Amino acid sequence: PRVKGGTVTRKRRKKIVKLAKGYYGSKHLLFKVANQAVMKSYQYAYRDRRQKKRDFRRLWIARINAAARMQDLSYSKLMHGLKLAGIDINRKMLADLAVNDIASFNTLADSAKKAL
């Protein structure tokens, strides 16, 4: 028997074109450039799921540095002192504590300073 190619091509291509909503001009209208744009977006998302974590760690470190300089310290000295004292609070918690509850940050800075 004969199989004519109806109703599957349109379904697949329409799914791809809808995945490209919001792109500029032809990139949200035409299948051939939408397909390329969708592939590029997937690749970019894959790489940025790796870059996001290291960007957030950079931000936390810079904030902790600024908070510790007001207590007559550096980030490097403070981290070494907190290691020497057996304190295992990570960058996320320390930066959160610096912005929001600076008194506990100063407490931990005193503890590190005594450890040195």
Partner: protein
């Protein structure tokens, strides 16, 4: 998840006066750029302006070491055939200290819209008086 991000106009910005007598151009420039960016506060957010305003006085007495007064050169091109112009650092210090400080500070700020915004918070004077007494600036020591 849950990390702090500052909003525009949220963090209160201060006014500072810095005396430029006898300090090397690059050392003062590094410190002032760090202040303008806002990296001395724990509320630093990379996409928001959280820094302060800086006034510099006595810019005619900035220091240059070595033979930088006669041997360091600043260049301009007008984009016309052969239109390159040259100017030494010492005679700018004599004639346009504000341009010298502005060029040095600008070279070490980020190159985007936000950096051009931050450049506008710097005021430089070659003498010892400024025009911003209504802003009540505060003395800041390097």
């Amino acid at each position: 998840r849950t990390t702090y991000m500052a909003k525009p106009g949220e963090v209160e910005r201060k006014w500072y006066v810095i005396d430029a007598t006898g300090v090397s151009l690059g050392r003062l420039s590094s410190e002032v750029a760090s202040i303008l960016r806002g990296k001395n506060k724990p509320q630093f957010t990379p996409h928001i302006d959280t820094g302060d305003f800086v006034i510099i006085i006595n810019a005619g007495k900035i220091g240059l070491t070595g033979k930088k007064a006669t041997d360091k050169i600043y260049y301009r091109h007008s984009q016309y055939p052969g239109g390159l112009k040259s100017r030494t650092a010492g005679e700018m210090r004599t004639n346009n200290p504000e341009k010298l400080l502005e060029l040095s500070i600008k070279g070490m700020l980020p190159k985007n819209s936000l950096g051009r915004q931050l450049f506008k918070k710097l005021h430089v004077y070659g003498g010892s008086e400024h025009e911003h007494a209504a802003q009540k600036p505060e003395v800041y020591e390097l």
